[PDB]
Subunit: 141 residues, 2 copies
């Protein structure tokens, strides 16, 4: 569950889970578009007397610093905000079934080309690399 995992990230990164923060995350997880701060404000202000466009931007900054949101900029336009779903990279042993997680700094080139050729709007990716782990390789010479 995406909201549950976002809240876990906040707790882990020491961010207070305020009602406004919860509501902004909920909005972001449920929205398909990349909203502006004004969009978020318009949607939520009716339930938060002390919410302002400033308060929305301030929270979005906290989220960006926690890795939950990316800020999209264009020309003279107000920023838009993309909720981030994690990518995953795994090495999988074909002999013993061992799975090892690793880190790689993104696959922008592939994602950009895939978006173009398939017409999809891209969220995130999972890469599985198959082969033989160090232990099995040693065993099999």
């Amino acid at each position: 569950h995406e909201l549950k995992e976002a809240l876990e990230t906040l707790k882990e990164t020491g961010v207070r889970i305020t009602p406004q923060r919860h509501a902004i995350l909920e909005y972001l997880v449920n929205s398909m578009a990349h909203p502006t701060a004004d969009d978020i404000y318009k949607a939520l202000e009716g339930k938060f007397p002390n919410m302002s466009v400033a308060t929305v931007y301030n929270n979005l900054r906290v989220f960006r610093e926690s890795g939950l949101v990316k800020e999209l900029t264009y020309g003279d336009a107000s920023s838009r905000f993309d909720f981030v779903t994690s990518d995953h990279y795994h090495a999988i042993c074909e002999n013993c079934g061992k799975i090892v997680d690793f880190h790689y700094p993104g696959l922008d080139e592939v994602e950009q080309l895939a978006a173009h050729v398939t017409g999809f709007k891209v969220s995130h990716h999972r890469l599985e690399i198959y082969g033989v782990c160090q232990e099995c390789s040693k065993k099999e010479n």
Copy 2:
């Protein structure tokens, strides 16, 4: 094995005759743990085949390399080794309607090389799944 069956299908589709010798070499490659030399293949099979020479082994490996079934691993002066190839796969997957669209990309060499270094794995092949929203779903969502 499923791997062998798929290799035989490739041969059939590309017009390569499926001879006993070819079948035996493919079966050997599919079953091999390390990348064999031509000499390894020859010695493994020579008992079964009277007309087999080291030349016919190399000739068949060239045919398989051309068909995309085998890659040759070269080393300065030294005898080459041969790697049976498992295909990579690239898929775009729609989170809204479940649509999967296959696409082509020319390998992920930089990622594979780094992954082997950090994890210690010897790499065979990969499957990349990209998640998003398809064109059709985006149209309804208000793109």
